[PDB]
Coordinates of C-alpha atoms and ligand atoms in Angstrom, one line a residue:
X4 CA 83.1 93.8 94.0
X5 CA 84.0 96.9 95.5
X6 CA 84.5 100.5 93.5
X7 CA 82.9 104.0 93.0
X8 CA 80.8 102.7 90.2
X9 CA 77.0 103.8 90.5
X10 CA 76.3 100.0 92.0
X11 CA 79.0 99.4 93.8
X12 CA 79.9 102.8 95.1
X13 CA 81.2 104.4 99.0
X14 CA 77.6 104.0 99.4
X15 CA 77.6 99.8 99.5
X16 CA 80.7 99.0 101.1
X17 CA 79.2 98.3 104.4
X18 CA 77.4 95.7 102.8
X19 CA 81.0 93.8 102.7
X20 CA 82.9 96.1 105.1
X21 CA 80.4 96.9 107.9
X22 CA 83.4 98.6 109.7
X23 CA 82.4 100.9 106.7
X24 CA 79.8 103.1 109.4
X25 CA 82.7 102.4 112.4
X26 CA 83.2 104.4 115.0
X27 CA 86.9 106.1 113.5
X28 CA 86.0 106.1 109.5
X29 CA 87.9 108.3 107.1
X30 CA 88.0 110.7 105.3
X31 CA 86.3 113.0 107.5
X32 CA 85.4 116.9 107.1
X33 CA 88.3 119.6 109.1
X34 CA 86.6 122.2 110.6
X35 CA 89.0 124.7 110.5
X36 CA 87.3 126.5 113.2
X37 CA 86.9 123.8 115.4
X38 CA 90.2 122.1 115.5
X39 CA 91.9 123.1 118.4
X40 CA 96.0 123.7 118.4
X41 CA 97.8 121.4 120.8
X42 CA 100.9 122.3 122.4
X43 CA 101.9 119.1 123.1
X44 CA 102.5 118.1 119.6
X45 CA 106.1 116.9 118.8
X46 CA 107.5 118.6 115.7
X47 CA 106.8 116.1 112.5
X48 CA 109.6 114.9 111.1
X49 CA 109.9 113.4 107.4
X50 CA 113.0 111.8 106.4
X51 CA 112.5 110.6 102.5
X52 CA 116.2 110.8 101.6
X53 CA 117.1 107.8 101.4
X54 CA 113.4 106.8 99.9
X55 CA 113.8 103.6 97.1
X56 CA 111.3 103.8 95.0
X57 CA 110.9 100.1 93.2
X58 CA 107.4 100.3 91.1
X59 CA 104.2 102.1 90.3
X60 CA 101.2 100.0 89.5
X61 CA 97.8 100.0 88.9
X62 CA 95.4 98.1 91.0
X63 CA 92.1 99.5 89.5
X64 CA 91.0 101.7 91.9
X65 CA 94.1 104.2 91.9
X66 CA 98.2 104.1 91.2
X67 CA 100.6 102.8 93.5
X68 CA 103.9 104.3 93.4
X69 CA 106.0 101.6 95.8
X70 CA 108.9 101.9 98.0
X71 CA 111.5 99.6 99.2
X72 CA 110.5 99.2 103.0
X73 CA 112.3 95.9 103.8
X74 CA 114.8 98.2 105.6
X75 CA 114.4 101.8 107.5
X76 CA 115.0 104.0 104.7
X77 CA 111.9 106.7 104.6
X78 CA 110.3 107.0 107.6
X79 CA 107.8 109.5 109.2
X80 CA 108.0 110.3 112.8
X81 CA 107.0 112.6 115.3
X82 CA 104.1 115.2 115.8
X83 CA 101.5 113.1 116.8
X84 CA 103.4 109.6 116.3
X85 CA 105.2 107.6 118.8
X86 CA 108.0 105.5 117.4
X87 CA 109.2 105.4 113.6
X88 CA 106.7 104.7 110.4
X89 CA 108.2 103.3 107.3
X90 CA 107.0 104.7 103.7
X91 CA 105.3 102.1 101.5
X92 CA 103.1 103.4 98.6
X93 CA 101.9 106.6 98.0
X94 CA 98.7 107.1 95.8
X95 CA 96.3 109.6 95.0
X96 CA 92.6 110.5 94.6
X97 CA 90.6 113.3 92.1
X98 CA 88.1 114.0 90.5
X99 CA 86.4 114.4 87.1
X100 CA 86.3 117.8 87.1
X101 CA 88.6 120.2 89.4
X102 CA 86.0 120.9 91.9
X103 CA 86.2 117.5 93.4
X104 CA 88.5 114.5 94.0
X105 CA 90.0 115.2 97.4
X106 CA 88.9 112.6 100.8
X107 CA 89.4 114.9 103.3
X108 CA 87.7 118.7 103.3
X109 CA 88.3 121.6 104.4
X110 CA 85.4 123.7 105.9
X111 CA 83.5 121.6 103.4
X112 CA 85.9 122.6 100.4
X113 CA 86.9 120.1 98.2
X114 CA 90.2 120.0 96.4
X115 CA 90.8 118.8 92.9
X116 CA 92.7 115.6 94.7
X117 CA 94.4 114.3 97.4
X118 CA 97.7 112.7 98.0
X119 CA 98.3 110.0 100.3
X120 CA 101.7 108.6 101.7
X121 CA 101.2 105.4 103.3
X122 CA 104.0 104.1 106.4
X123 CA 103.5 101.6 108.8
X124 CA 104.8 100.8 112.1
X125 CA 108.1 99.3 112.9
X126 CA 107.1 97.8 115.7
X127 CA 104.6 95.6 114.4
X128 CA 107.1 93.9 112.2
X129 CA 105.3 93.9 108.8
X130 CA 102.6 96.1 106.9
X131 CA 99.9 92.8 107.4
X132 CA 100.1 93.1 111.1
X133 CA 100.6 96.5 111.5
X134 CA 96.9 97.5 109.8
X135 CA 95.8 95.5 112.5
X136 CA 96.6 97.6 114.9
X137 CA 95.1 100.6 116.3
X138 CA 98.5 102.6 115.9
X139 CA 99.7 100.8 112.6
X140 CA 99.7 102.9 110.1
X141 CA 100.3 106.8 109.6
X142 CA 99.0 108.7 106.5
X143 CA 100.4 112.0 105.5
X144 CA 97.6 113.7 103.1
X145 CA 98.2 116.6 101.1
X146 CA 95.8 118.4 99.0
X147 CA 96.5 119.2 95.5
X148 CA 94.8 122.7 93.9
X149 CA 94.8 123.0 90.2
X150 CA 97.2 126.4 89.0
X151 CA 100.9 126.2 88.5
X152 CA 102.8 122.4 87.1
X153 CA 104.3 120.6 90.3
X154 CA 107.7 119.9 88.5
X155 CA 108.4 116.9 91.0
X156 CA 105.1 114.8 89.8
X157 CA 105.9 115.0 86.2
X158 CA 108.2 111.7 86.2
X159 CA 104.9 110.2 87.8
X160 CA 102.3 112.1 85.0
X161 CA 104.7 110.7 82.2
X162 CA 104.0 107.0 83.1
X163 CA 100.7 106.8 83.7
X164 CA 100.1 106.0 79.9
X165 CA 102.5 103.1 80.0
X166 CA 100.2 101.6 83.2
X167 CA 96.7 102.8 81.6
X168 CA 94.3 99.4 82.7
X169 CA 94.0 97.5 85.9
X170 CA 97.2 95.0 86.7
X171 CA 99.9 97.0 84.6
X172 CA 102.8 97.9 86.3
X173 CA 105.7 99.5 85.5
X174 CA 109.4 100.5 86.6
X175 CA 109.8 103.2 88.7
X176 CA 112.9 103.8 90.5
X177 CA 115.1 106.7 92.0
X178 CA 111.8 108.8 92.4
X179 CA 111.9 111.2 95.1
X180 CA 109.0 112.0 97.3
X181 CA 110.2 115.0 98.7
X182 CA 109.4 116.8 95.1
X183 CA 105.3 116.4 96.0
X184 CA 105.3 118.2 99.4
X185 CA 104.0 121.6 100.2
X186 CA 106.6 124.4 101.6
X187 CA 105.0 124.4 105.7
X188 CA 104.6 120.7 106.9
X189 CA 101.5 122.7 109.6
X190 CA 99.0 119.7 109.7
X191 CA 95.6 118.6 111.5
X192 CA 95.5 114.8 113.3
X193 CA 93.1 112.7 114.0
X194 CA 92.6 109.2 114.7
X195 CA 91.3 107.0 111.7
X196 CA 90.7 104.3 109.0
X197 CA 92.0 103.0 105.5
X198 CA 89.7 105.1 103.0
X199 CA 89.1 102.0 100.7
X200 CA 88.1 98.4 101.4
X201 CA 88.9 96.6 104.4
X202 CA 88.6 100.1 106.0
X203 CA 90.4 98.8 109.1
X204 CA 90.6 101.4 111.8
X205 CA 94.6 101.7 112.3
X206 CA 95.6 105.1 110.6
X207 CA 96.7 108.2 112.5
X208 CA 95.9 110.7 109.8
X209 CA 98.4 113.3 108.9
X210 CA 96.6 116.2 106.8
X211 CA 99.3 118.9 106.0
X212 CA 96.9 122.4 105.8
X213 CA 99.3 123.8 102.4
X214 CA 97.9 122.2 99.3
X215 CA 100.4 121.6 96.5
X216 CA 99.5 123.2 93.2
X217 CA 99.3 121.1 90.2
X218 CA 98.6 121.5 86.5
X219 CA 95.4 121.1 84.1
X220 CA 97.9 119.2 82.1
X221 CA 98.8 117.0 84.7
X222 CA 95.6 116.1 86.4
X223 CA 94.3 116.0 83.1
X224 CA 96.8 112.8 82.6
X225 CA 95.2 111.3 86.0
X226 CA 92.5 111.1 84.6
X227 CA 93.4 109.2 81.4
X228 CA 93.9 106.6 83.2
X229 CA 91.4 103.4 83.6
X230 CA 89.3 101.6 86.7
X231 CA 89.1 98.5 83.9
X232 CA 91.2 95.8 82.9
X233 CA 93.6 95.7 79.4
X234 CA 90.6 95.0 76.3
X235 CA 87.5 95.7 78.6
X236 CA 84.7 98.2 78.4
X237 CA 87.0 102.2 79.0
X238 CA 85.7 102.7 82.5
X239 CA 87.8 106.4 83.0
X240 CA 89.8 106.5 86.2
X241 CA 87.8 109.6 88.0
X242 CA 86.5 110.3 91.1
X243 CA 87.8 107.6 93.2
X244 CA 87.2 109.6 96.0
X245 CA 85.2 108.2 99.5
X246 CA 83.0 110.8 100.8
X247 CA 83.4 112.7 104.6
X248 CA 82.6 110.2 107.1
X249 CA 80.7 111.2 110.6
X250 CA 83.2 112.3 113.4
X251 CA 81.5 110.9 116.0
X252 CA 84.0 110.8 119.1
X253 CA 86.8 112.8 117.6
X254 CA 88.6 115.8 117.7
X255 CA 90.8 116.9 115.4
X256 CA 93.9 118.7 116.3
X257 CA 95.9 121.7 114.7
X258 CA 100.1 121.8 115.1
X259 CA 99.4 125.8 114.0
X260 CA 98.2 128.4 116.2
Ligands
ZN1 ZN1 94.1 107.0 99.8

């Protein structure tokens, strides 16, 4: 099935997914010259302190850190959004080396990775329906540079070893999102897709312009992890990454003058 392998890489998921060359695909390339600001952007708004945090997994193409959304706890709202998103998972995506790993780019610059927090829409009642709506989901990404330790992803670094193969899971509670975001919450928008497999078309992307800085210690950890099940052949957890995708009928738009 489905991965970045060398056979059954970005590169073949149309074969399965033919949404995979759509017409709102994701990641896509920011061109920071480009983007225009738009004044009629609402102020964003994320409210993670009352965010439960129940589990982190792996499901063998990244880590899952999972949230309690039976009830509206951590939600995302405004700037670009109408109505309230509730926070599911976050997960992340890097690279092999620190010169790649990140979804998104910036004027063609890739990041060492890229953090995505996953909400869906209330008013579609449950995450299942809501990805098949246009408006169902709303990704916040944040780019993560290699320099300085992020103190708040430690508690996530130091269980990764306990999770290392595809289908362990592990306990992860009283975690607090809030510890991975940048200090400005200035962000681009555009229309888009999930970046893995069934690449439905339902995310209003969220790309905050401050990346977070991380350690070589820390991504280092990432990237102990494996794509392969408990006893199997090590397949080393890099470069889960989906390429830029065409822009086709897009604009992006800047909150930041
Ligand atoms: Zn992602």
């Amino acid at each position: 099935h489905w991965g970045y392998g060398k056979h059954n890489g970005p590169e073949h998921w149309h074969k399965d997914f033919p949404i995979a060359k759509g017409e709102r695909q994701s990641p896509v390339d920011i061109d920071t010259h480009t983007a225009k600001y738009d004044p009629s952007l609402k102020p964003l708004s994320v409210s993670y302190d009352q965010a439960t945090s129940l589990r982190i997994l792996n499901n063998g193409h990244a880590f899952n850190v999972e949230f309690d959304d039976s009830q509206d706890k951590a939600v995302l709202k405004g700037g670009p959004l109408d109505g309230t998103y509730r926070l599911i998972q976050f997960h992340f995506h890097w690279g092999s080396l620190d010169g790649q790993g990140s979804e998104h780019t910036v004027d063609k610059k890739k990041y060492a990775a890229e953090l995505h927090l996953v909400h869906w829409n209330t008013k579609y009642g449950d995450f299942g329906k809501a990805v098949q709506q246009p408006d169902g989901l709303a990704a916040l990404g944040i780019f993560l540079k290699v320099g300085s330790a992020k103190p708040g992803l430690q508690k996530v670094v130091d269980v990764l070893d306990s999770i290392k193969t595809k289908g362990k899971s592990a306990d992860f509670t009283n975690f607090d999102p809030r510890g991975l975001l940048p200090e400005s919450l200035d962000y681009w928008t555009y229309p888009g897709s999930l970046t893995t497999p069934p690449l439905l078309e339902c995310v209003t992307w969220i790309v905050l312009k401050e990346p977070i800085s991380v350690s070589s210690e820390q991504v280092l950890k990432f990237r102990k992890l494996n794509f392969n099940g408990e006893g199997e052949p090590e397949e080393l957890m890099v470069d889960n990454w989906r390429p830029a995708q065409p822009l086709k009928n897009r604009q992006i738009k800047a909150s930041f003058k």
